[PDB]
Design a protein around this ligand. Structure first.
Ligand SMILES: [Zn+2]
Ligand SMILES: [Zn+2]
Lengths: 442, 57, 69, 108, 85, 63, 121, 286, 147, 57, 49, 196
RNA sequence: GACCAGGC
DNA sequence: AAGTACTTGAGCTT
DNA sequence: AAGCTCAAGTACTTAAGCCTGGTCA
């Protein structure tokens, strides 16, 4: 039977703790949010910000300077790319003049009825001729809201005795955002288990085509940058198993035997070794697999080499991804296999992807034959939680993309008007960026 | 014991005879702006059901 | 927030017995049982007022706009 | 029960290749083995050549961190065995005929 | 009923009274049969052997399902003999 | 060479077409260009027995 | 196309081939000095006072019931000791198949629950 | 999707959800359920897996549900037999707990799924990634705190109390059986005597109370702020009412209450208040 | 039972045992049309009855050496209208809506369930109360506010 | 409301003298009708009563 | 019946959506009406009257 | 609400006869000898394959519900009213049950006697894929407690597994009370519109 | 008017 | 998603 | 050849009554 603790209480009220808070469990229940938002800038490798903005790579556009050689020469080349992303703690100068700035505490931002924001900064790398000459420069994308009690807020590490001095709640746990005076926070969502290949049965797999059955294999994959990609395998009644992905609010369909040979140079005797293995006795297998192989031949009479497959991919897929006119389709075919198929294994993951995608297929036929039961998608067994900060870090990575895209668009419009264009002029750049609309924060 | 919200001071009101809706010249929706209460589809069958109509009209 | 001046049900004035209850708890290191019963609180009515009370005002006073830090 | 160990070879002698089941190569075929000293682990690469086929093979970087492989010669008219260290190489057979076949960069 | 007008309800039924003299064992006699009967009911397993292919069908013991589903070797041959193929 | 109606060249790995659709007495891969005689075999019987999933019954609804 | 750091294995040591003799494949943990052992069973064994388990993984590398279903092919030094040939015994050049494949792997133990200390009224 | 599934024992609170249209959709984690925001070190997992007898995946072709599968985070490390994978998933479990093997933190899940008849496709899984659910237990062979995930839970035997543990059956036990509830399902006194929909309604009402919103009230600009003038620490108390420190925020007031039919205004859901309690300050608010 | 088939020497590998599994389960040996199955219910309330799923009257009419043809009642509204006419349907509807409220122990005076039933059959056929039956009414403003 | 999930409305402020006064002189604060319990099945309130009195004494 | 404008933004509801949906115009402002001379409040038991 | 010092003894006597119940329902469905022990393997296989179907488990649950519901009316009719400590009229709770003023016999017997079987869609506790009804039970448990049958009572308390079962039966109620009203809520608008 | 709340 | 009523096409009969 | 019931397949609509507020483009 517990007690009231009348003395120890008034001891706490009168003199608040000067070392660490007295209620450890109250500060450990909010850990989901602070952990996520701290995970952005911290971590040995630079967090989600510095790794994510690296994923975008380069954006390419061409000037068309003839050089006076019909000429396949497209002119001096422009490579726009970001490098790192940094976030500065909340700071406010007094008006103009850039006098030595002072900190802004939350209790000032609740009363003033504006947001509590730390600054955002980009290091934008501007290159020509693929690394002969380049320009390092820094810019300003505006103010970025910042979680309280985290590494980018000043209240981090203060002891409860100094949470009072700055006019806060003694135990205050923060863990939310101040938007225009309101306290807004992100709430947790339940998505599918990352990096696991669920076996599915849904009626909606049936209506997508004539011969589609309701069996299927679904994998949701996620990169070191926490961005996600969805990959599905549908089983047609006539034995064809199709690969499916979703891009820019579109859906596409590709035969799987294409991608298997696309990943690593291979010949079908090894595929049959991979799927069936030592099970050659069973008749339900060799039949389905032979109707699977035969289908790729005589559908596309000429593909004798991995490269001839890659280029065939590049022809159809050159348009959507908006690749630069210089890249040979051979390359773009390699852009796909990095940017879509089974992305969580990296850009060197060809050899491992070739195993994973086989293992799925085996587990799909084992689902058709009834040897294994379909995973229950409603249950908590297959589910995880998607934290607030890990949502807040995907979006910024998407907006930097739309930013670079917007610059590239501005230069292209600068071309077709016909104005003089010189890419070795830094002052030309400082002329360019202002015309573009740069505020990410707002 | 715990006291809750939903004090009656928040919930009650009377008439519509303040301002009226502009389109249909009807009682405006209300409380904060002092509008009326809504007769309704099923409430319309309680009128007819008794046979009472002068009270319906 | 602060000590109530009258016990609700009984009506006796329990408002002056909080300080001395703290003193009795502190100096002589008694328990809650004998401390309440020494002040002359008999009914289980008037005992719950002092026994369970919370001074939250001590936390309010810490925030004073009218003095320097 | 009990088996005595006559000899144990520490040096490159034989090698082991997994190609596929029922694998064989023409009579002449001959395989060149190669070796690198990375840390205190030994990596191996295999390259074979005949008139119309190539053969290549590598040691699995991941398994060789925790698996050591050894070929044994057994004398059952004795309680004896002769162990030789051997790498296991993951290997393929490539047809010289179709290796370099290739379509155009794009069928535009 | 009310809302639909539906000509095909989910689970229709009929209701059959019977004479008094008909016994309770004759109850199990008359209507057990005269039900929808698929050939898939009497088939224990199928073997397919492959250019041509062969079909084997190993049924149950005739005496067994002769008493239950009330079908005899004669009709069973005729139905397979025509509409199946 | 032969597994369950699948027959593959010993050099390259491509899938051999119908042995009967090849006119010459030697099947030749489209890659390695290796040669096989036509008939070492009749087409294999493909032993096939399938699951108990489908059908209802009297006995399996008992046993 | 030799990669960086590899040198061709010049002088290949000798491999004496041939109730007749048998050829085995054996996996040991990489941390085990094989050069100093003595025993070997035909269950359990200890090497350097630490204990391991020997498993007959022959049915994984090959088929027990049917011939020519072997994953692995043995390569022995050729008549120059500067290259390798597929090891055969059949006077038919039919590749040698391993007679047995053994996996020497580590084993673990668990401690019993003390129900006196743990199952309390 | 609105049913209460038994696979959620110990993570999602059974009792506490708001009813109405949201009922069943919103959930709250059991107050000991933690969510991991860090990427654990997977570097040295493969070598240990190899020294436990896992054959390399890069070679030695094999496949089929007939034999075990061992994976990490979406890479296939190796294939081993089922009763091998049980010796592994048991051993690796223990080396995780005792802590004498480096590069193998306790947060890692070990998910071994035994092959069965027409159940889930078997395998052995290792998940070190972000945003996974974890709850503590007490590992029986030793006595220590351990971490169990939602995926490795369904196949392992977790006893509720040390009195109920069967010999040769249970490999784990809860710290305390209250670890399965949420914060506000603990703050109900004797929640096991009441009927369950009543516990749920309580969980909802307790969030509508007129409480102490904060001590900062003079510096805070919020639009509408309810506060109660006088609180009291309740007499009937849960021990978790001390740890989270609700006493900095007293939610209500004790009362001397009699169960009787006397007045005649108090029937069904109505109640009566002594008139000299109010005028003396009982229930006041701002 | 054993027999053989043959096809073209040049053919595909097309799946067979699936075809067999498909044709075996449509293999209608003997089907008295629309009948499904029989169950002998309990001798309830002194009445002795048989019940079969599916509705076929013209088939049940030949069994009268066994089951009586005058007391055959149905759970369908329409099929009784195809045979016995609007009157046996109007009488059926009441006995269907009754048996829903009889199992809940509730009670609804038949003066209501008669007015509904007579309000459906006013056209000689069986009309719903939804959009499709209200189509034939005279007044617009009733229909115009419905859907 | 209580912590056991009894939501209720103050009906009338009842004079102090008309409350039934205990043997000891304590008028109750809040009267609650028994007939509410056997439908709602709350025994935690009956038990919290005793645990409250024995605690206050 | 109107072709898309910027594929989104919602259409500006037309005169046929004035009287052709959910509440529309025939069942909002006719089959029921907000009314003068009406009140609303909480109820409390009185055994006396 | 209290039983006598005698009546509780009866209660514990007639409940102890339900310790072995579930297995006897496991034998009659699986077609074995009535004495087949609980952990026997070939028993476990039949208990295993029977699960993957919805219909078969729907049969087994209706088989056990008969027995675990029989035990209930064996206990209650023997215990209350003659096991009560205060006899009606002196006892108020029964005066509320008997007089029909509020509540009914079931609500009193749940306080004074036992909860009885839990029912979700007419069946027993929804079974996880691994054959465990809840993480604390051995896989494929023949026992009666593994179907949600609760021997506890709101007066003396209910064990953790019991409470976690009763939460389900509590939620199903609220859900269905949400789905009912709208359904008949729409139907009635069709009738009154045409019969207006 | 669109999204979260909340009451029977 | 559940369900109805409406509508277009190629086989089949005079 | 041409007619007309045949069949599957392609569009189209509704889905309980209230009251409170809350921020926002
Ligand atoms: Zn008092
Ligand atoms: Zn070939």
């Amino acid at each position: 039977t517990a007690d009231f603790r009348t003395l120890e209480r008034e001891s706490r009220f009168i003199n608040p703790p000067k070392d660490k808070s007295a209620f450890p469990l109250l500060q450990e229940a909010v850990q989901p949010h602070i952990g996520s938002f701290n995970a952005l800038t911290e971590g040995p490798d630079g967090g989600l910000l510095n790794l994510g903005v690296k994923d975008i790579g380069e954006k390419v556009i061409f000037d068309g300077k003839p050089l006076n050689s019909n000429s396949g020469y497209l002119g001096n080349k422009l490579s726009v790319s970001v490098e790192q992303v940094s976030i500065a703690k909340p700071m406010s100068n007094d008006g103009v003049s850039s006098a030595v700035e002072r900190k802004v505490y939350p209790s000032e931002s609740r009363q003033r009825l504006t947001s509590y924001r730390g600054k955002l900064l980009l290091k934008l790398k501007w290159s020509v001729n693929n690394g002969e000459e380049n320009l390092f420069e820094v810019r300003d994308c505006g103010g970025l809201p910042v979680m309280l009690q985290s590494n980018r807020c000043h209240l981090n590490k203060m002891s409860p005795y100094e949470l009072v001095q700055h006019k806060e709640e003694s135990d205050e746990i923060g863990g939310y955002f101040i938007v225009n005076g309101i306290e807004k926070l992100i709430r947790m969502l339940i998505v599918q288990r990352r990096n696991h290949p669920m076996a599915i049965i849904r009626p909606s797999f049936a209506n997508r085509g004539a011969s589609y059955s309701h069996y299927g294999i679904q994998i949701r994959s996620v990169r070191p940058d926490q961005t996600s990609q969805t990959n599905v395998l549908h089983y047609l009644n006539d034995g064809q198993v199709t690969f499916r992905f979703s891009w820019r609010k579109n859906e596409y369909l590709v035969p799987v035997v294409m991608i298997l040979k696309a990943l690593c140079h291979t010949s079908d005797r090894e595929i049959f070794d991979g799927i069936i293995g030592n099970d050659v006795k069973d008749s339900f297998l060799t039949d389905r697999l032979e109707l699977l192989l035969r289908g790729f031949k005589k559908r596309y009479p000429h593909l004798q080499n991995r490269t001839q497959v890659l280029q065939y991919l590049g022809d159809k897929f050159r348009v959507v991804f908006q690749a630069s006119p210089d890249q040979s389709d051979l390359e773009v075919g390699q852009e796909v296999l990095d940017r879509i198929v089974l992305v969580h294994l990296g850009k060197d993951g060809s050899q491992d992807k070739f195993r994973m995608l086989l293992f799925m297929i085996r587990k799909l036929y084992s689902l058709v034959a009834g040897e294994c039961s379909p995973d229950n998608p409603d249950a908590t067994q297959h589910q995880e939680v998607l934290l607030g900060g890990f949502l807040y870090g995907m979006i910024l990575k998407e907006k930097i993309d739309e930013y670079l895209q917007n610059i590239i668009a501005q230069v292209r419009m600068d071309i077709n008007r016909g104005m003089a264009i010189n890419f070795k002029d830094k002052r030309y750049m400082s002329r360019v960026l202002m015309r573009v609309n740069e505020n990410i924060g707002s | 014991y715990q006291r809750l919200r939903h004090m009656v001071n928040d919930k009650f009101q009377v008439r519509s005879t303040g301002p009226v809706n502009s389109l249909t010249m009807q009682p405006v929706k209300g409380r904060k702006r002092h509008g009326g209460i809504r007769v309704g589809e099923m409430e319309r069958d309680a009128l007819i059901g008794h046979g009472t109509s002068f009270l319906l009209q | 927030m602060i000590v109530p001046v009258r016990c609700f049900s009984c009506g006796k004035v329990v408002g002056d017995k909080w300080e001395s209850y703290l003193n009795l708890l502190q100096e002589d290191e008694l328990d809650e049982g004998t401390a309440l019963s020494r002040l002359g609180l008999k009914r289980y009515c008037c005992r719950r007022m002092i026994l369970t009370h919370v001074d939250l005002i001590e936390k309010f006073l810490r925030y004073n706009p009218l003095e320097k830090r | 029960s009990e088996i005595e160990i006559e000899s144990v070879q520490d040096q490159p002698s034989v090698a082991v290749g997994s190609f596929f089941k029922g694998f064989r190569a023409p009579s002449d075929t001959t395989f060149d083995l190669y070796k690198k000293k990375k840390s205190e682990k030994d990596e191996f690469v295999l390259h074979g050549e005949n008139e119309r086929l190539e053969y290549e093979g590598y040691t699995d970087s991941s398994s060789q961190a925790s698996n050591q492989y050894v070929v044994g010669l057994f004398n059952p008219e004795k309680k004896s065995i002769q162990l030789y260290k051997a790498p296991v190489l993951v290997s393929k057979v490539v047809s010289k005929s179709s290796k370099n076949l290739r379509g155009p960069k794009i069928k535009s | 009923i009310v809302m639909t007008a539906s000509a095909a309800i989910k689970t229709p039924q009929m209701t059959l009274p019977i004479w008094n003299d008909v016994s309770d064992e004759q109850a199990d006699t008359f209507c057990k049969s005269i039900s929808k009967v698929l050939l898939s009911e009497v088939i224990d397993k199928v073997i397919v052997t492959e250019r041509s292919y062969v079909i084997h069908m190993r049924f149950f013991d005739n005496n067994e399902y002769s008493e239950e589903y009330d079908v005899s070797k004669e009709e069973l041959q005729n139905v397979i003999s025509n509409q199946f193929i | 060479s032969v597994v369950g109606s699948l027959i593959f060249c010993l050099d390259c790995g491509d899938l051999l077409e119908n042995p009967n659709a090849v006119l010459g007495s030697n099947v030749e891969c489209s890659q390695c260009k290796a040669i096989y005689p036509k008939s070492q075999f009749s087409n294999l019987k493909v032993v096939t027995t399938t699951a108990d999933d489908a059908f209802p019954s009297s006995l399996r609804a008992k046993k | 196309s030799i990669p960086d750091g590899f040198k061709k294995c010049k002088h290949l040591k000798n491999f004496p081939l041939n109730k007749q003799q048998q050829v085995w494949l054996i996996k040991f943990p990489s941390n085990v000095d094989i050069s100093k052992l003595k025993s070997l069973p035909v269950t359990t064994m200890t090497i350097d006072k630490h204990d391991y388990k020997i498993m007959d993984d022959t049915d994984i590398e090959s088929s027990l019931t049917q011939d020519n279903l072997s994953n692995m092919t043995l390569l022995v030094p050729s008549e120059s000791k500067e290259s390798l040939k597929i090891a055969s015994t059949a006077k038919d050049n039919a590749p040698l198949q391993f007679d047995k494949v053994f996996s020497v792997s580590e084993t673990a133990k668990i401690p019993a629950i003390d129900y006196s200390k743990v199952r309390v009224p | 999707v609105r049913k209460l599934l038994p696979e959620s024992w110990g993570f999602l609170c059974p009792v506490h959800t708001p009813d109405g249209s949201p009922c069943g959709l919103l959930n709250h984690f059991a107050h000991k359920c933690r969510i991991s925001t860090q990427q654990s070190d997977v570097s040295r997992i493969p070598s240990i897996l190899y020294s436990l007898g896992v054959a390399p995946a890069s070679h030695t072709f094999a496949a089929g549900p007939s034999l075990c599968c061992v994976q990490i985070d979406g890479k296939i490390i190796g294939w081993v037999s089922h009763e091998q994978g049980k010796i592994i998933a048991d051993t690796l479990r223990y080396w995780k707990v005792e802590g004498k093997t480096p590069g193998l933190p306790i947060d890692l899940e070990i998910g071994y799924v035994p092959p069965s008849t027409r159940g889930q496709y078997p395998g052995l899984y290792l998940f070190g990634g972000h945003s996974r659910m974890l709850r503590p237990v007490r590992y029986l062979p030793l006595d220590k705190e351990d971490i169990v995930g939602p995926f490795e839970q369904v196949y392992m035997n977790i006893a509720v109390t040390p009195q109920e543990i069967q010999n040769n059956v249970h490999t784990h036990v809860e710290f305390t059986p209250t670890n399965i509830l949420s914060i506000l399902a603990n703050l109900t006194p004797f929640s096991d005597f009441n009927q369950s929909p009543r516990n749920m309604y309580q969980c909802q009402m307790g969030k509508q109370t007129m409480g102490t919103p904060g001590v900062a009230l003079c510096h805070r600009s919020d639009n509408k702020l309810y506060r109660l003038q006088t609180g009291q620490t309740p007499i009937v108390k849960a021990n978790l009412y001390d740890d989270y420190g609700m006493d900095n925020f007293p939610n209500g007031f004790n009362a001397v209450v009699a169960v009787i039919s006397y007045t005649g205004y108090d029937m069904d859901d109505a109640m009566i208040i002594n008139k000299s309690a109010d005028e003396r300050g009982f229930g006041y608010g701002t | 039972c054993e027999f053989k088939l043959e096809l073209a020497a040049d053919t595909e590998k097309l799946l067979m045992v699936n075809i067999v599994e498909e044709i075996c389960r449509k293999s209608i040996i003997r089907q008295i049309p629309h009948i499904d199955r029989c169950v002998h219910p309990e001798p309830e309330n002194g009445k002795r009855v048989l019940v079969t799923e599916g509705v076929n009257f013209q088939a049940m009419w030949d069994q009268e050496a066994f089951i009586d043809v005058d007391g055959i009642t149905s759970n369908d509204v329409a099929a009784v209208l195809k045979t016995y006419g609007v009157e046996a349907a109007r009488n059926t509807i009441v006995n269907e809506i009754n048996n829903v409220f009889s199992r809940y122990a509730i009670s609804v005076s038949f003066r209501h369930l008669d007015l509904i039933a007579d309000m459906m059959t006013r056209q000689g056929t069986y009309l719903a109360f939804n959009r499709q039956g209200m189509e034939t009414s005279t007044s617009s403003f009733m229909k115009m506010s419905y859907e | 409301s209580s912590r056991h999930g009894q939501k209720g409305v103050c009906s009338r402020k009842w004079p102090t003298i008309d409350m039934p006064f205990s043997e000891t002189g304590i008028q109750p604060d809040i009267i609650i009708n028994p007939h509410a319990f056997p439908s709602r099945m709350t025994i935690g309130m009956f038990v919290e009563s005793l645990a409250g009195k024995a605690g206050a004494l | 019946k109107a072709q898309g404008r910027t594929s989104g933004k919602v259409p500006i509801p037309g005169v046929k959506q004035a009287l052709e949906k959910k509440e529309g115009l025939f069942r909002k402002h006719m089959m029921g009406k907000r009314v003068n001379y009406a009140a609303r409040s909480v109820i409390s038991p009185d055994p006396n009257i | 609400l209290r039983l006598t010092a005698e009546g509780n003894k009866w209660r514990t006597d007639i409940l102890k006869t339900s310790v072995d119940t579930g297995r006897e329902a496991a034998a009659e469905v699986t077609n074995l000898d009535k004495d087949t022990p609980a952990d026997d393997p070939e028993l476990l296989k039949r208990l295993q394959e029977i699960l993957r179907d919805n219909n078969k488990s729907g049969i087994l649950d209706a088989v056990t519900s008969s027995k675990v519901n029989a035990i209930t009316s064996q206990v209650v009719s023997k215990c209350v009213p003659d096991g009560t400590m205060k006899k009606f009229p002196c006892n108020s709770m029964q005066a509320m049950a008997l007089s029909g003023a509020k509540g009914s016999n079931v609500n009193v017997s749940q306080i004074m006697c036992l909860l009885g079987q839990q029912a979700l869609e007419g069946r027993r506790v929804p079974v996880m894929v691994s054959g465990k009804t809840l993480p604390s039970f051995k896989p494929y448990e023949t026992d009666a407690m593994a179907g949600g049958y609760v021997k506890g009572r709101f007066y003396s308390g209910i064990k953790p597994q019991e409470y976690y079962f009763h939460c389900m039966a509590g939620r199903e109620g609220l859900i269905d009370t949400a789905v009912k009203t709208s359904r008949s809520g729409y139907l009635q608008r069709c009738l009154t519109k045409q019969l207006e």
